[PDB]
Design a protein around this nucleic acid. Structure first.
Ligand SMILES: [Mg+2]
Ligand SMILES: [Mg+2]
Ligand SMILES: [Mg+2]
Ligand SMILES: [Mg+2]
Ligand SMILES: [Mg+2]
Ligand SMILES: [Mg+2]
Ligand SMILES: [Mg+2]
Ligand SMILES: [Mg+2]
Ligand SMILES: [Mg+2]
Ligand SMILES: [Mg+2]
Ligand SMILES: [Mg+2]
Ligand SMILES: [Mg+2]
Ligand SMILES: [Mg+2]
Ligand SMILES: [Mg+2]
Ligand SMILES: [Mg+2]
Ligand SMILES: [Mg+2]
Ligand SMILES: [Mg+2]
Ligand SMILES: [Mg+2]
Ligand SMILES: [Mg+2]
Ligand SMILES: [Mg+2]
Ligand SMILES: [Mg+2]
Ligand SMILES: [Mg+2]
Ligand SMILES: [Mg+2]
Ligand SMILES: [Mg+2]
Ligand SMILES: [Mg+2]
Ligand SMILES: [Mg+2]
Ligand SMILES: [Mg+2]
Ligand SMILES: [Mg+2]
Ligand SMILES: [Mg+2]
Ligand SMILES: [Mg+2]
Ligand SMILES: [Mg+2]
Ligand SMILES: [Mg+2]
Ligand SMILES: [Mg+2]
Ligand SMILES: [Mg+2]
Ligand SMILES: [Mg+2]
Ligand SMILES: [Zn+2]
Lengths: 240, 16, 108, 45
RNA sequence: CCUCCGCAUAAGCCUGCGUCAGAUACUGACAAUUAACAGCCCAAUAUCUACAAUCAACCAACAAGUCAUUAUUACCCUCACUGUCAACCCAACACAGGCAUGCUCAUAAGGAAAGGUUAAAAAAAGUAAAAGGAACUCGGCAAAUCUUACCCCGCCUGUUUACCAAAAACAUCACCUCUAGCAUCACCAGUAUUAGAGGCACCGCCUUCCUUAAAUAGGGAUGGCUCCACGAGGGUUCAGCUGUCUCUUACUUUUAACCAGUGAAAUUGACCUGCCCGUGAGAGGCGGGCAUAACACAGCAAGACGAGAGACCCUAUGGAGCUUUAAUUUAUUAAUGCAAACAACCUGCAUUAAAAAUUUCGGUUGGGGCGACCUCGGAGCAGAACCCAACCUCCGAGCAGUACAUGCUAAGACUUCACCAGUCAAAGCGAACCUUUGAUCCA
RNA sequence: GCUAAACCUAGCCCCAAACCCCACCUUACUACCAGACAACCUUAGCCAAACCAUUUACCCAAAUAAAGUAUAGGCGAUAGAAAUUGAAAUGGCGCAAUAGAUAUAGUACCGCAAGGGAAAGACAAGCAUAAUAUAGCAAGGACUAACCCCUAUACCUUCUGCAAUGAAUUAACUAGAAAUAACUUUGCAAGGAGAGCCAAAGCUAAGACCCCCGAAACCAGACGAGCUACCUAAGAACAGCUAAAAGAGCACACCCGUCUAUGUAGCAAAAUAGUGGGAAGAUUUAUAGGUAGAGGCGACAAACCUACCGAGCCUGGUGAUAGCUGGUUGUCCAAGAUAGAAUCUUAGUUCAACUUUAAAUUUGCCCACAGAACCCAAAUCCCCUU
């Protein structure tokens, strides 16, 4: 197929980008993921997941003003247009982020624990143990990848040496260098669980389509079965 | 079902 | 139901050469004593009728020219006059259709 | 109900069976070569 | 007198009812659609752009909705080219079908249901119907009317077997289970309130009588439950309504029949093609009787084992599909292990899986289940050479005991009806001094 | 006397020899701007093995011979060398328009496509002249005489045998291809043969003998998503009333297809009329694009993927295979019959038995006695005669 990814834009921008739906299809044109197709046309707002991104020819901790908090069609979380210095960027909004609020993005690992105010980003080394966090990086400067969905919140479980133990929302422990940045608080749109789809049409609007033949293997779906050993073959299906 | 078979048109388009 | 056997030409001849299928000879054909044309007894002579139809068509063309338009049927009688004819006392107050030919012998 | 499977459109015809698409693959080039060998008046569509 | 028709665009088609001349909207010749409509574009590099739409003003949201421009640098010429017709396209057809959009909502546009006749049957559609009003029928199907009530199933709106099934089936919100801690081609420019897969079913809670006169019909005395609403679902019912029926009739149109024109198809061994009884297991044709001038036309459907298709059973060391604890593999992937190259990556060799791949379906017993049997020997079972009652009945053998010449050789014979195989055996040599199966290949 | 009937070269087959202006890859046949993707990679399977699973000949670089030998091989079906040896050089006991090329042409036409692919040019049948006469396989025996009389259960094939199969009819076309031995007739003869091979009368040569059509399939490589299924991009449509931001109600357009009737070679290879469901949505729909066959797609009906999808279509392997069905064409004569065993075998085959031909030789069949068991019938066997 003549499929070229829509994710071709190279320069970050605030303008929503026209994104092409896939239908669950590979670049080969064959269905790779079932149950995807249609839905409301959407525009993609490029999220800057690296909260500590000091502006060009600038460095050090910087503050930013929350211009607005907006619904994002491409996420469970709602996003925040936030402006600092002479630039604007989209970030993931925390639970109580409001328009006009101020946000701190620092790389400073203070000797003492920094007062953790919801919404600001500090290196994990600077946070008190037991603080709720989100938008957690795996490596310093990689960019947030974990705890990004609406209402999610990891816990800074431990800090020893230069390594911090985080409890991901799946209640799995993760080891990250304490120099990696995370933002304080739980992600916004905390009521995303309680939303009721109500009707099949709403899922169709969200772009989920009812799809069958999801396995493509001979015989379709087949649950795993325990293959009895030769000694145990005599007891597999004992008649009544 | 067996589809109908059409004879060639020339058999029936002949003219003096 | 399909035929069980081909019908023979002998059977077919017996069928399609029956007197019921043969064309009957007409015995009402005679000769029009007027013009000597063949006519059936109860039917008008074809040639004489064609004559009358052609003359009527000419008269009606003249009538159409005189009327000049639809929905112009006169509320008065009509008289056809040929070359060398003059309206009579009875033909007074009747629209005159003038024909360029002479009065036909069969017209009166 | 059936029989009208052909819904003509010159764009689709040329894009599906045209000379350029035939030459776009080695298999289609061999299609054209077979038609030329047979002597077809119309090599492509 | 008739039409959701017409006119345009799109798409498609490609000169396909313009003129003339020859033929019976055909052939040939001649002509024609004129750009303003439409198509065919942009000089780039950068950098810009959060703020829907819905009369966009209030109100109302969620499903969150392309609108891409500006600064600098280049730039000077100017209207080319192409579509433009038609009664049209896709359906083999001048096909009652398919066919996007803008306008007209009955036309200002576009058309003609009747070739002529007659007024049979049967057939189709329609209209009307005394009295009755479901008595019809599987069923109130259809028609005419307009209502009532309740069960079963599915929560609902949707989806499906294009062309016999629209459903109780599939989906579905809701819920549950399982898997996954993560970036530059799907999932996803997402990140556990996420994503993928499976199940389940919205939700919510608790843990003999009646009906009719007659009623095989109907209704009522983690699961168990709860039917709000909805349904061309499946049952039942009141009332009404009706040609469904008692029980059919009349009329109109189509069809029909006759006249004229044009003109198929399945089918067909040949036919000079009767009835009764008999035969055969079923007769137009055979036997015995009977009948019997010859042909049209219109009906009918008893026969012509009517025609054309199809169903049921059986078979084939015929296919194909499916499932597996059928057999054979693991080439390929995925894991490991060992070597190889110095962790990644990769090669080779193994092992385990996943996914697959290839292949098969013995015989006898109305079929199937559960069986039993399949070779050999002995007896029934064949009275008197042999052979045979297969199928079948009973019994026992895959030997045991003995000897270790119970060796070697060799005339002549028998034989399980073929062959294979299996038996007996004189003479001779040598020691001593017999009573139950299986080939070839391969090891 | 109509329809017809006939014709002979247009060409073709097999050999030999010889080695054979302009436009056009974009939507081809389109005068005129930033390239870069540029190719290489065991065939498989049908089939034979009477299944099938290892296996099962296939442009080779001198014919013959070695030799179907050595070898290989579920050592079986079958496959199969080499050393060595060393062949010389413009025609038709071909077709003559259903033949010979498919060919007048890869045209017309058919298909979306890949593909498929024609026809034809120079008194047969059917009818008419001239319908028919009781009764019957349509005739035969006849007869003065057509009929009347008497006799007479169509053909082919498959069944044990009549039922069943096929056949409108004419013309043309349409189906027994070969070795191991034998036999016969020549030649020469302990040798034959124009190297090789055979030879204890052989050797050399000739003559005689082994059909046609048909699956469902399998695999390879193409072609197909202008239908349909799903998806992508960017569009469009949805009156009126009720209701009020609704997978809301009634109901147009539009989409569908509940029920009935008509239609059933039809208007239609799924339509028509009425009725009915949806009709601001999980809606309908135009345009362009995408996913391709063991694959796609599927709100799962094994549904749909160009009218025939439990697995598309085309071409090729391919003249697949068929123990099954059907067919298998001059005349005449002669001989000619039921039968055991084994078999993944009982729809087949091989051996036996029977059968046919040729040949050699001498007994063969029938049978009178005599003879064939104890346990406790009819007949049969055997053979001097005849
Ligand atoms: Mg279409
Ligand atoms: Mg059609
Ligand atoms: Mg008319
Ligand atoms: Mg009429
Ligand atoms: Mg009444
Ligand atoms: Mg009743
Ligand atoms: Mg009632
Ligand atoms: Mg009754
Ligand atoms: Mg009804
Ligand atoms: Mg439902
Ligand atoms: Mg519904
Ligand atoms: Mg259906
Ligand atoms: Mg239906
Ligand atoms: Mg009842
Ligand atoms: Mg007529
Ligand atoms: Mg009888
Ligand atoms: Mg008969
Ligand atoms: Mg009759
Ligand atoms: Mg029949
Ligand atoms: Mg015995
Ligand atoms: Mg024997
Ligand atoms: Mg085989
Ligand atoms: Mg020819
Ligand atoms: Mg004749
Ligand atoms: Mg027949
Ligand atoms: Mg499409
Ligand atoms: Mg509306
Ligand atoms: Mg609605
Ligand atoms: Mg669907
Ligand atoms: Mg099912
Ligand atoms: Mg098809
Ligand atoms: Mg064959
Ligand atoms: Mg004889
Ligand atoms: Mg065996
Ligand atoms: Mg057999
Ligand atoms: Zn006269």
């Amino acid at each position: 197929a003549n499929f070229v990814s829509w994710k071709s834009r190279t320069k970050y921008t605030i303008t929503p980008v026209k994104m092409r739906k896939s239908g669950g299809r590979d670049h080969t044109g064959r269905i790779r993921v079932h149950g995807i197709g249609g839905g409301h046309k959407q525009r993609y707002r490029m999220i800057d997941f690296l909260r500590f991104r000091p502006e060009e020819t600038k460095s050090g901790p910087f503050e930013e003003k929350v211009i607005q908090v907006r619904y994002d069609p491409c996420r469970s979380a709602d996003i925040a247009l936030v402006a600092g210095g002479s630039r604007k960027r989209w970030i993931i909004a925390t639970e109580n982020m409001q328009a006009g609020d101020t946000i701190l993005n620092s790389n400073h690992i203070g000797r003492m624990a920094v007062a953790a105010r919801e919404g600001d980003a500090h290196p994990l080394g600077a946070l008190p143990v037991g603080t709720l966090i989100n938008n957690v990086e795996s490596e310093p400067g990689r960019g947030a990848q974990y705890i990004r969905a609406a209402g999610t919140c990891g816990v800074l479980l431990r800090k020893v040496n230069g390594t911090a133990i985080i409890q991901l929302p799946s209640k799995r422990q993760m080891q990250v260098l304490e120099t990696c940045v995370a933002t304080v608080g739980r992600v916004s749109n905390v009521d995303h669980n309680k939303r009721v789809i109500g009707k099949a049409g709403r899922n169709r609007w969200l772009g989920k389509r009812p799809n069958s033949g999801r396995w493509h293997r001979k015989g379709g779906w087949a649950g795993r079965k325990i293959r009895p050993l030769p000694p145990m073959k005599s007891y597999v299906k004992l008649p009544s | 079902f067996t589809p109908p078979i059409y004879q060639p048109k020339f058999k029936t388009e002949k003219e003096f | 139901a399909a035929p069980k056997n081909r019908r023979t030409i002998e059977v077919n001849r017996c069928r399609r050469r029956n007197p019921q299928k043969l064309i009957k000879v007409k015995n009402n054909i005679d000769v029009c004593p007027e013009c000597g044309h063949l006519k059936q007894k109860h039917v008008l002579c074809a040639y004489c009728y064609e004559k009358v139809c052609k003359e009527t068509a000419e008269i009606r063309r003249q009538i159409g020219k005189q009327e000049g338009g639809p929905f112009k049927a006169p509320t008065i009688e009509t008289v056809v006059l040929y070359t060398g004819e003059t309206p009579s006392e009875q033909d007074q107050g009747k629209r005159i259709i003038e024909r360029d030919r002479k009065r036909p012998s069969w017209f009166t | 109900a059936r029989g009208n499977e052909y819904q003509p459109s010159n764009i689709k015809r040329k894009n599906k069976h045209g000379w350029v698409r035939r030459l776009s693959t080695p298999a289609g080039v061999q299609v054209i070569l077979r038609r030329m060998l047979k002597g077809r008046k119309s090599l492509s569509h």
